[PDB]
Amino acid sequence: TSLGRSIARSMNRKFHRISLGGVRDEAEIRGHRRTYIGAMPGKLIHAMKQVGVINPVILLDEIDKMSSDWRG
Amino acid sequence: DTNQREYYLREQMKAIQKELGGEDGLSDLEALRKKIEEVGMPEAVKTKALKELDRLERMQQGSPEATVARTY
Amino acid sequence: DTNQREYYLREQMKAIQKELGGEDGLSDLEALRKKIEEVGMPEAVKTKALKELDRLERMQQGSPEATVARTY
Amino acid sequence: RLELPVIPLRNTVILPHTTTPVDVGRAKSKRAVEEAMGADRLIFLVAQRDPEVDDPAPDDLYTWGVQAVVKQAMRLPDGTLQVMVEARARAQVTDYIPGPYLRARGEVFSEIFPIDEAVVRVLVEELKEAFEKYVANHKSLRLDRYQLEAVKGTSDPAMLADTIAYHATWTVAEKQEILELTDLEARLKKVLGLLSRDLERFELDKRVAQRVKEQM
Amino acid sequence: AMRLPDGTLQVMVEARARAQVTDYIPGPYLRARGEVFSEIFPIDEAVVRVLVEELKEAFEKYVANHKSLRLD
16 A cells, blocks of 8 residues: 555656445445435545546555445 | 514615625626536536526525535 | 725624524624634645535524534 | 823723813712812823723723813812813823822823924815715714814814814724824824725615615 | 944034045055045036936926825
């Protein structure tokens, strides 16, 4: 995970890290519909708003620890 | 005369407020309309956004449906 | 002097805003607006908090939407 | 110099150089009031500050003040005592005690030299016309005008400005902040800006009255 | 002159016509020859005359925003 920030500093891109360890909610990737009360988009659209550029470097960290079979 | 004074005062209030938001470019819905054609964006998404803004401009403000559409 | 004229205007809105239906308090949303510019805080999260405050300010209170945006 | 008892007031501040009958109706300043009118025609003055004290503390008075040599021998015996103030300069305190009595040693309260008379006379004409458009809206905000339109050309322009200045019913704050200086040009032109902003806010309320009428 | 104890021990003179210094003997201290007395006049007064006329009509323009010392 040091190479993520080193590569993004090297190519003069923006950078944003999403930590996926232990996440087991499907609505963290997508969102909820805007019918529900506190609904808002997922992590990806949120990261793209934080970066502000169509072209970032996203580090999806520890992708083999995505838990399954609780809600989905 | 208490009720008439209370109504009169409410209109004093909203009179200063439309002074404090009566500029040609002040209507934040006008500013939102300009921001829609400034940024981006693809054509179908732009059509959907303009229909959603036209639906928003007819509602009464502060109602919950207007809040859902404005944050979208 | 232009700000003086403006702040008088909204002093008058203070007067009628108070007396138009009784005074709940110094307007605890204004207490939040004071407290946001006291504690800390980093610049990006201060921008996010002020946008969230202005969103809470123009919706009708007692909404189930508003009781989430106040607790946040 | 010259330690003598000071005369404090409540909120309606009275001024140097300013011919004013002042019904001082206090409760626990009358010791200094009686001794000062019986003490060879000399009075010092400040007012006090908000939520105030009847018993005049050393937590009351303010910074620059006024040598007010007394112009009339007239006590009205009901507790509401009347006096004339008419000064020559301003004043301050050096030594003191929690009063009454209110002791005020003084110092050389350094004045300024007036040299300009040309931008001053343009300011005299602008300031008289600015008061004449001031008082018009401030008739409605309670002012009369025959006690000033007689003395339009007082040889001191600053005393004409004092006579305007007690009759310009703005705050405690501007009265003391402009009471607490040593000039006439920059001081009284910012006074003129106060006159203009008051007229412009009154006309702004005229615009909003039109807005309410039409929307109803 | 006038000798004061506050570090000021002055002198008072009056000038007629300036000069140069020929060749020094450098100091502290100094002894220095000067050349001749110079109060040299304009020759063919038209150029300096137009300069006087413009400098006068612009000293009318100069002094108006130079009244800040409160001079009559």
